[PDB]
Design a protein around this ligand. Structure first.
Ligand code: 3EH
Length: 265
């Protein structure tokens, strides 16, 4: 059996978990502050989940959340992310990110997704709520592999039994329930829109499963007030009806780099 957990196991003598310090919550379990013998986040789980998520051990990229290990109700040990999720970060009105900052965040997400696409890995739930910020404000694509969960149940709906983030899903995934790198690209465009609105909910006048017909009618998210025309063009390409006509993440990194660079920090 693929218990490659073996290589990833943190012995019981190497992890102190602080169960009184809940720093997060998912459908599968809580996240606790821990001490790895460094600071860390420790996600509780409550076979197929582990085997399908354990690939993340091989991943290392600055804009992708890494795995520190598994301790054994097994515990997934992840890097501490001081500034929480990206969506809450930008909704905090005590801080005013610049437009350059916000595009910067999307550029970092694009870089993380470029890496994951180059490893032939499909995220399936890319969204601002699922990216995390560390102490240096580096954005990490998260909520995948052993970190995979629903961290905000408002935005997931059932339909097979799966809980689907319908307002981030590509048109073909809404029809077929199948995901691909190119459906991640669709989601990426929605995340960009989230960034430019500082975390407004998409399609707020559309009841969850009325989204499919809305998109079939030839309709899309409207251009945010602070979103520059070239970036809205990127968003619209990301939501092309034909998957293969959507840009690659490599093209997105390049084009968003250019747009980012035209702004004053
Ligand atoms: C008191 C809360 N934080 C300050 C703002 C403490 C900072 C330290 O906490 C961590 O390091 N957490 C940590 C690290 C690695 C992975 C994960 C799991 N996960 N968490 C997600 C998440 C986290 C907080 C949220 O909102 C509260 C939220 O909302 C929709 C979603 C989605 S993406 C992901 O993979 C969590």
């Amino acid at each position: 059996l693929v218990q490659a957990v073996q290589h990833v196991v943190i012995g019981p003598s190497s992890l102190i978990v602080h169960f009184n310090e809940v720093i997060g919550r998912g459908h599968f379990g809580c996240v606790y502050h821990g001490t790895l013998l460094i600071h860390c986040a420790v996600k509780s789980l409550n076979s197929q989940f582990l085997t399908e998520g354990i690939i993340m051990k091989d991943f290392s990229h600055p804009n992708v959340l890494s795995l520190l290990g598994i301790c054994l109700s097994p515990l997934v040990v992840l890097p501490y992310m001081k500034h929480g999720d990206l969506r809450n970060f930008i909704r905090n009105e005590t801080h005013n990110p610049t437009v350059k900052d916000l595009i910067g965040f999307g550029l970092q997400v694009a870089k993380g997704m470029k890496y994951l696409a180059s490893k032939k890995f499909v995220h399936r739930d890319l969204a601002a709520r699922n990216c995390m910020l560390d102490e240096k404000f580096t954005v990490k694509v998260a909520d995948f592999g052993l970190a995979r969960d629903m961290y905000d149940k408002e935005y997931y709906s059932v339909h097979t039994g799966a809980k689907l983030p319908v307002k981030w899903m590509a048109l073909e995934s809404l029809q077929t329930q199948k995901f691909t790198t190119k459906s991640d690209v669709w989601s990426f465009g929605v995340l960009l829109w989230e960034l430019m609105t500082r975390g407004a909910p998409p399609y707020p006048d559309v009841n969850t499963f009325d989204i499919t017909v809305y998109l079939l009618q030839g309709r899309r998210l409207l251009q945010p007030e602070y979103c520059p025309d070239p970036l809205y063009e990127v968003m619209l390409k990301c939501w092309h009806p034909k998957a293969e006509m959507r840009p690659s993440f490599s093209e997105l990194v390049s084009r968003i780099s250019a747009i980012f660079s035209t702004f004053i920090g």
